[PDB]
Amino acid sequence: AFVVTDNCIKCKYTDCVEVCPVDCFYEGPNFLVIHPDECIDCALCEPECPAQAIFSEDEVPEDMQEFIQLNAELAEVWPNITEKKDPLPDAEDWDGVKGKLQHLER
Numbered sequence: 107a108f109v110v111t112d113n114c115i116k117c118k119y120t121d122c123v124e125v126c127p128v129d130c131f132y133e134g135p136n137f138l139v140i141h142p143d144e145c146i147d148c149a150l151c152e153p154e155c156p157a158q159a160i161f162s163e164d165e166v167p168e169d170m171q172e173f174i175q176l177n178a179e180l181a182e183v184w185p186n187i188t189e190k191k192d193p194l195p196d197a198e199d200w201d202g203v204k205g206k207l208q209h210l211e212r
């Protein structure tokens with residue numbers, strides 16, 4: 107599975123979903139997650155993220171390992187998203203800020 111990590115929070119550009127062949131992204135208020143059972147590891151979304159927030163799970167940074175289980179858990183509760191929409195309004199101010207998990211909204 108590919109995993110969405112920290113920099114997606116408060117950016118949520120959603121470019122990643124246009125390229126997903128199996129529609130396995132699920133939508134929260136200010137973050138997206140990949141459903142690990144659905145992902146076919148095609149790696150097509152990883153170059154599309156402007157925030158460079160998607161990683162193969164075997165390449166998730168050490169300080170972002172929490173995101174693996176978070177994607178698995180929230181994917182089970184959030185609605186499926188299959189079409190790109192506009193980025194959050196201040197996405198570029200928050201792109202690159204570290205430690206945005208304290209801002210995640212359920």
Ligand code: SF4
Nearest residue numbers: 126145146148149151
């Ligand atoms: S690696 Fe492929 S199947 Fe998995 S979320 Fe990305 S685009 Fe979808």
Ligand code: F3S
Nearest residue numbers: 114119120121122155
């Ligand atoms: S910012 Fe998030 S919504 Fe997709 S394009 Fe990147 S993983």
